[PDB]
Design a protein around this nucleic acid. Structure first.
Length: 21
DNA sequence: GGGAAATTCCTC
DNA sequence: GAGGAATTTCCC
């Protein structure tokens, strides 16, 4: 695992940045 | 227990 | 090279 591959997902503590239409 | 939103990895 | 699809987390 030489390439830090992060799993698809939403970081913890990530709130909505605005009005998601 | 279900729904909605944001981020990231893979294909052509 | 640029774009699309898949997976995870939080709140009621």
């Amino acid at each position: 695992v030489p390439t830090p591959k992060r799993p698809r997902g939403r970081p913890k503590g990530s709130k909505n940045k605005g009005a998601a239409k």
